Design a protein around this nucleic acid. Structure first.
Lengths: 79, 137
DNA sequence: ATCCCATTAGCATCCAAACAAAGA
DNA sequence: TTCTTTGTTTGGATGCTAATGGGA
């Protein structure tokens, strides 16, 4: 299988709100959701973010342990 | 069949064929290393792919890049160039001052300046030549 | 040898692409 | 594939100039 990128603080946090907005407000597109979470996040205090930034660290550590040789290789799509 | 249009079409062709193999500009330059006794920087590959080299320079790399691409789609001596090394800031200012006193230091002066700045003769020699260039512009 | 300077070529740097999540 | 966000990493672009070629 292909190795995904580890989640950053924002991706971890948004993962939460995503449901608490998607189920709460269906028929709404992830696009609009992302836009919203986006805005909400840039409004959190370094103290409100701290736990997700911290959990992101562990996820990053977890990723290396489970993929010691993984190197991110984004490939310029064909176009 | 114009010299320039072929060269023009090869850079485009080359690039597509390059991205196809999921190959980085840096990987190709790296691969040229093994092949020709000198690596080629990412900078050079990018300029080549974008028509940013001289006509002369491009025409010369075409063959090397072409051979490599084919060999890859299927699947008293000379010296390897000196690595490029930056002139630290403090040295830059000193060399900069010496240049003001005069732009044509002699061999021993060059040896002296270098010895004083704990730099390689040759590098200092080359710097006065290049800085003399930057001047006349 | 030297020395000279038109050419060639890359370090440093910076910007924009890719991508994780999710699932319409 | 796209649609969207942030954050992170990496690819690619590019100034400046270092280093080379080879003539004389």
């Amino acid at each position: 299988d292909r190795v995904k990128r580890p989640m950053n603080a924002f991706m971890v946090w948004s993962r939460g709100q995503r449901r608490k907005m998607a189920q709460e407000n269906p028929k709404m597109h992830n696009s609009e959701i992302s836009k919203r979470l986006g805005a909400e996040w840039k409004l959190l205090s370094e103290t409100e973010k701290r736990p997700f930034i911290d959990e992101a660290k562990r996820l990053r550590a977890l990723h290396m342990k489970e993929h010691p040789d993984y190197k991110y290789r984004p490939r310029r799509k064909t176009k | 069949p114009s010299d320039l249009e072929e060269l023009e079409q090869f850079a485009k062709t080359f690039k597509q064929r390059r991205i196809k193999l999921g190959f980085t500009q840096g990987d190709v330059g790296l691969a040229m290393g093994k092949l020709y006794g000198n690596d080629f920087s990412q900078t050079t590959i990018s300029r080549f792919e974008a028509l940013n080299l001289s006509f002369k320079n491009m025409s010369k790399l075409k063959p090397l890049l072409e051979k490599w691409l084919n060999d890859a789609e299927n699947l008293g001596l000379s010296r390897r160039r000196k690595k490029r090394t930056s002139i630290e800031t403090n040295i830059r200012v000193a060399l900069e001052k010496s240049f003001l006193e005069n732009q044509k230091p002699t061999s021993e002066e060059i040896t002296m300046i270098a010895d004083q700045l704990n730099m390689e003769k040759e590098v200092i020699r080359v710097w006065f030549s290049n800085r003399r260039q930057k001047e006349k512009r």
